[PDB]
C-alpha cells in the first residue's frame, strides 16, 4: 500500500541525527535527503558544470566554489536548486520504490525553509534549547559560538517551525528522548 511519509527536521544542534539513528535502531526506514542531494549533484554534474563554469576547476566541479558561488547571489542558488531538487526527488522515489514498509522517515534538514511541508504526510520536529544546541555544536567545530549563533539564524526560527510541525520532540536524557519518539511513533500505529 501507500506508506505514510514523515519529514524529520530540526535546527543546528537539535540532534535530529540521534533521533533517526534511534528510529533505524528500532527498525524503520529513514532515508537521508542530504545524501541524495549529494548523489543528485554528482548525477546532474554535467548540467551543473555548465550552469556554473566558474566552479569547474580542471574538468572537476569544485564543491567548495559551487557553494561559495551559489550562496553569493539568490538567482544562482535558485538556478541550482532547479536541477537538484527534481533529481533529488527522482531518486527519492527510486529509493521508495524498493521499500515495503508502511511508514517511512525523511531527514530533510531545511524541510520547511525549502518547502517540503506540502510534500509529506506529516512532520516530526526535533527541538532543544538554543543554549544546549549551541554547546552541542561547539563540540563539533568549536566555531566561536558567535559564529554558530549566526548560522542558527540562517534557518527558519525554531519557534516558527514549532508552530507548524505535526509533532515536536524535546531533549534531555536519552531515556526521555527514547520515550517521546516512542509516543509520537505510536500516534502512527506501525508495530
Curated annotation (Swiss-Prot):
Residues 5-191 form the DPCK domain. It is found in: Cytoplasm. It catalyses: 3'-dephospho-CoA + ATP = ADP + CoA + H(+). It comes from the Bacteria. One of its GO terms (biological process) is coenzyme A biosynthetic process. InterPro entries: Depp_CoAkinase (IPR001977), P-loop_NTPase (IPR027417). PROSITE patterns: DPCK (PS51219). Keywords: ATP-binding, Coenzyme A biosynthesis, Cytoplasm, Kinase, Nucleotide-binding, Transferase. Pathway: Cofactor biosynthesis; coenzyme A biosynthesis; CoA from (R)-pantothenate: step 5/5. Its EC number is 2.7.1.24. GO terms for molecular function: ATP binding; dephospho-CoA kinase activity. ATP binds at residues 11-18, 140, 171. Pfam families: CoaE. Disulfide bonds: none annotated. One of its GO terms (cellular component) is cytoplasm. It is an enzyme of class 2 (transferase). NCBIfam families: dephospho-CoA kinase. Catalyzes the phosphorylation of the 3'-hydroxyl group of dephosphocoenzyme A to form coenzyme A. Belongs to the CoaE family. This is Dephospho-CoA kinase. It comes from Thermus thermophilus (strain ATCC 27634 / DSM 579 / HB8). The lineage of its organism: Bacteria, Thermotogati, Deinococcota, Deinococci, Thermales. The gene is coaE.
Amino acid at each position: 500500500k501507500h506508506p505514510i511519509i514523515i519529514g524529520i527536521t530540526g535546527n543546528i544542534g537539535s540532534g535530529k541525527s540521534t533521533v533517526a539513528a534511534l528510529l533505524r535502531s528500532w527498525g524503520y526506514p529513514v532515508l537521508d535527503l542530504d545524501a541524495l542531494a549529494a548523489r543528485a549533484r554528482e548525477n546532474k554534474e554535467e548540467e551543473l558544470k555548465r550552469l556554473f563554469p566558474e566552479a569547474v576547476v580542471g574538468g572537476r566541479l569544485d564543491r567548495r566554489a559551487l557553494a561559495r558561488l551559489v550562496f553569493s547571489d539568490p538567482e544562482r542558488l535558485k538556478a541550482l536548486e532547479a536541477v537538484v531538487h527534481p533529481e533529488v526527488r527522482r531518486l527519492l522515489m527510486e529509493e521508495l520504490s524498493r521499500l515495503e514498509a508502511p511508514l517511512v522517515f525523511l531527514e530533510i534538514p531545511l524541510l520547511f525553509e525549502k518547502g517540503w511541508e506540502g510534500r509529506l504526510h506529516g512532520t516530526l520536529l526535533v527541538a532543544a534549547p538554543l543554549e544546549e544546541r549551541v554547546r552541542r555544536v561547539m563540540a563539533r567545530s568549536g566555531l566561536s559560538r558567535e559564529e554558530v549563533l549566526a548560522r542558527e539564524r540562517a534557518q527558519m526560527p525554531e519557534e516558527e517551525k514549532r508552530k507548524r510541525a505535526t509533532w515536536v520532540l524535546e531533549n534531555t536524557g536519552s531515556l526521555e528522548d527514547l520515550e517521546r519518539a516512542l509516543k509520537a511513533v505510536l500516534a502512527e500505529l506501525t508495530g
